[PDB]
Amino acid sequence: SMQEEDTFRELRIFLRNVTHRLAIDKRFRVFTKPVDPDEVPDYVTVIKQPMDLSSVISKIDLHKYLTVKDYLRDIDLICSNALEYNPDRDPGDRLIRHRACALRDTAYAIIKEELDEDFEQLCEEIQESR
Numbered sequence: 001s002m003q004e005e006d007t008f009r010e011l012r013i014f015l016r017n018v019t020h021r022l023a024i025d026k027r028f029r030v031f032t033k034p035v036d037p038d039e040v041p042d043y044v045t046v047i048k049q050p051m052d053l054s055s056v057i058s059k060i061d062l063h064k065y066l067t068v069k070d071y072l073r074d075i076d077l078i079c080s081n082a083l084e085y086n087p088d089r090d091p092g093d094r095l096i097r098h099r100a101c102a103l104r105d106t107a108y109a110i111i112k113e114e115l116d117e118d119f120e121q122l123c124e125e126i127q128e129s130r
């Protein structure tokens with residue numbers, strides 16, 4: 001219905017705003033664009049499902065997220081990919097892992113503070129009805 005399309009449009013506006021706030025944070029610059037195989041050849045051999053904040057924005061605009069949980073699964077994938085690709089004790093690895101955990105914690109904290117729980121529940125119930 002039109003009432004349901006209005007709900008999903010509000011969800012997309014909310015998700016674009018969260019993603020923008022993550023993408024302008026200097027700590028998260030390494031997560032803003034797809035990893036370039038020219039700059040990192042070994043990446044596609046370790047990471048089977050790449051994800052980044054620019055790809056998240058594209059998926060919002062393709063109506064791929066109908067619930068906040070679907071969105072957080074891709075935020076969680078950005079983080080888990082970084083942890084898997086950077087497992088070593090070296091300072092370069094530890095720095096990326098710290099930033100990845102901060103990206104995940106920041107996204108969850110914004111949603112916990114700013115998303116109405118009844119709004120997320122409505123999105124879930126519309127989705128389960130389709």
Ligand SMILES: CC(=O)c1nc(NC(=O)[C@@H](C)N)sc1-c1cccc(N)c1
Pocket residue numbers: 029030031034035036081082085086092093096
């Ligand atoms: C996001 C990620 O997993 C990632 N990990 C790196 N690890 C390392 O450089 C070594 C030291 N552990 S670099 C890097 C990355 C990816 C895209 C762009 C830029 N600037 C960095």
